[PDB]
Design a protein around this nucleic acid. Structure first.
Lengths: 123, 138, 36, 133, 175
RNA sequence: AUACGUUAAGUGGAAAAGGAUGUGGAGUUGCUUAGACAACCAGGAUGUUGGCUUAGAAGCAGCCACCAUUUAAAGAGUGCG
């Protein structure tokens, strides 16, 4: 179970310095659809963005216990968490929204995440 | 195919097997080895049938071990000859076998391949046998 | 086929006793077998 | 979508292209001028080209670099590598020379970084048995 | 991790009698059924929820307990949604058409084929290819589906006669 | 007859090598409510069939150095092709 702690402690370090994030459903997650997003990360930055689909209520929600206490509602069903390190927010909220509109994975109608104390409506 | 270069006597008594093996019960020259559960005669041809079965499946690997060299002849009177009128002749050779004895040994071989080579030998040998490994207390 | 020592031939094969007689069944018809 | 290795300098006869893309509804006469256009910069080489197939019989093509590790034979200076790599280290290449090779493969490579583009080529140089120095 | 412990909701309207010993006369708009039950099983009716419980962990009881729930779920659905099984005829001259309640089948045998459905079952023929056997009883609809299949065993070399939709008959290469 | 069990084939009331999710006990061990075996919905690697080859055969003539990256994940390959 020691390996599971590495899954937990490391991601929390990002969330403590995290700026913005967005809901992404895992359904019909084609590998080609992922690469189109991964290339966008290469423009915005490098490895700093995180895809980690460790979205168990027993997993990521425990990380949310410290900060971002709005994940409890988003927790049921498939999720694909994203985290920012530096990068002033702008396109990150917009780029994923453009992808789902052109087929490729349900957006979940954007359940939303931390920005202030709100949920829905990407800007 | 293994036969003695010489023997002191052309023929010998068949004997009476009983009890635990006098020795060689514990494998150590090889990482793994077949161990008989009972005791029965084994003709020289049966031994050759086992080693040939292993050399093909093993491919490249360590040398096959043979702890048992046959020494006791089995008498074979010619067919339709009437009883008595002298003892017959040794058609071949048979090693003495005792329960718990290590019939064969193998070493330097991977764990998966080792399970099979011991198994194919078990079919050629009429005696029931079981998988065995080296002990190191030790 | 019917042999006293029925054995699996491939991973798809499955051992299932039926009516007191063990039978191995597989997606490939050739691998179908019954003991006794 | 049917990939093909159409030569850069020529595009017209049926046996290389022809029916194989002609059954796709592609208008062969209208695209052959295009193959000779952008590929003219690298004439004399066999350039692979992806071919997406739109329902409206519109088409857009993407040219690619000549195949990998062929360049490694040139940097090594030897026409052919060992049939027994590592066991027979016939050739050696400096790490800086590899940098010149990886940059050429960038449009073809999906590698995220130039440092990662190095590591991709390193797995190809070992196939030739060439030492990385 | 287990079968019969799971609850079974009744969407409705499906009443369930608890007459001994033990007969379960499920009732509703589509039909009625009375599955046999040996006394060792214990059926109970929570509000709009059928329930089943095991008397003991013994291996014989472990087998019977998982069957009783699966049957009752098959029963309620047939009293509601019902059931049907498609049959894809394949060939050239093959065709089928009803003649009264009887289902004539123009199978490639020179002899005409006819099959009579049992009461509570009907067989519409929307198309010459497809065949649909509607019925409230899964044990019976699957039996009739087998009896229709009996008329023509499928040929591995070529798609012919009865074939489940969908199912891949093994390919064979002739010469 | 009493008490603890076992057996389901008529074994009991006929043998063997060998074969088997038969069943009753005992022991060891992997994983496991920071998540198990079943699933049902997700995706399958990137350069690449990659070296040496056989007309060409790209997960696969077969012999292998069988590499490193994209990473929630995948062998330059488990398999039916």
């Amino acid at each position: 179970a020691i390996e599971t702690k590495k899954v937990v402690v490391e991601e929390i370090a990002s969330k403590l310095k995290e700026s913005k994030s967005t809901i992404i459903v895992d359904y019909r997650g084609l590998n080609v659809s992922e690469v189109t997003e991964l290339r966008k990360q290469l423009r915005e930055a490098n490895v700093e963005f995180k895809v980690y689909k460790n979205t168990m209520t027993r997993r990521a929600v425990e990380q949310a216990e410290l900060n971002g206490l709005n994940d409890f509602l988003t927790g049921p069903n498939a999720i694909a968490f994203s985290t920012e390190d530096v990068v002033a927010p702008a396109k990150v909220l917009n780029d994923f929204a453009k992808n789902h509109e052109a087929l490729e994975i349900k957006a979940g109608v954007i359940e939303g995440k931390v920005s202030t104390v709100e949920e829905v409506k990407a800007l | 195919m293994l036969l003695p270069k010489r023997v002191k006597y052309r023929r010998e008594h068949r004997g009476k097997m009983r009890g635990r093996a006098k020795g060689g019960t514990e494998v150590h020259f090889g990482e793994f080895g077949i161990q008989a559960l009972e005791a029965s005669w084994i003709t020289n041809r049966q031994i050759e049938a086992a080693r040939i079965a292993m050399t093909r499946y093993m491919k490249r690997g360590g040398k096959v071990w043979i702890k048992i060299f046959p020494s006791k002849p089995y008498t074979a009177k010619p067919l339709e000859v009437r009883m008595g009128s002298g003892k017959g002749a040794p058609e071949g050779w048979v090693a003495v076998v005792k329960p718990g004895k290590v019939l064969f040994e193998i070493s330097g071989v991977s764990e998966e391949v080792a399970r099979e080579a011991l198994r194919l030998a078990s079919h050629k040998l009429p005696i029931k046998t079981k998988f065995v490994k080296r002990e190191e207390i030790g | 086929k019917v042999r006293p020592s029925v054995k699996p031939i491939c991973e798809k094969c499955k051992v299932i006793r039926r009516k007191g007689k063990v039978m191995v069944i597989c997606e490939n018809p050739k691998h179908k077998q019954k003991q006794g | 979508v049917v990939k093909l290795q159409i030569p850069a300098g020529k595009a017209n006869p049926a046996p290389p292209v022809g029916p194989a893309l002609g059954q796709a509804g592609v208008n062969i006469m209208g695209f052959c001028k295009e193959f000779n256009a952008r590929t003219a910069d690298q004439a004399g080489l066999i350039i692979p080209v992806e071919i997406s197939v739109y329902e409206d019989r519109s088409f857009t093509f993407i040219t690619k670099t000549p195949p990998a590790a062929v360049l490694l034979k040139k940097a090594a200076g030897i026409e052919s590598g060992s049939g027994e790599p590592n066991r027979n280290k016939v050739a050696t290449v400096k790490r800086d020379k590899v940098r010149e090779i990886a940059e050429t493969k960038m449009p073809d490579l999906n590698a995220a970084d130039v440092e990662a583009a190095m590591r991709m080529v390193e797995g190809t140089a070992r196939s030739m048995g060439i030492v990385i120095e | 991790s287990r079968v019969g412990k799971k609850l079974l909701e009744i969407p409705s309207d499906v009443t369930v009698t608890l007459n001994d010993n033990n007969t379960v006369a499920v009732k509703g708009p589509k039909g009625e059924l009375t599955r046999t039950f040996h006394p060792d099983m214990e059926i109970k009716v929570e509000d709009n929820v059928l329930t089943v419980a095991r008397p003991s962990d013994q291996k014989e009881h472990r087998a019977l307990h998982g069957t009783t729930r699966s049957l009752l779920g098959n029963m309620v659905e047939g009293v509601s949604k019902g059931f049907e099984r498609g049959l894809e005829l394949v060939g050239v001259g093959y065709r089928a058409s009803k003649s009264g309640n009887k289902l004539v089948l123009n199978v490639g045998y020179s002899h005409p084929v006819e099959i009579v459905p049992e009461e509570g079952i009907e067989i519409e023929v929307p198309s010459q290819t497809k065949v649909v056997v509607k019925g409230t009883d899964k044990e019976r609809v699957g039996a009739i589906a087998a009896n229709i299949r009996a008329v023509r065993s499928p040929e591995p070399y070529k798609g012919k006669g009865i074939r489940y939709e969908g199912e891949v008959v093994r390919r064979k290469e002739g010469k």
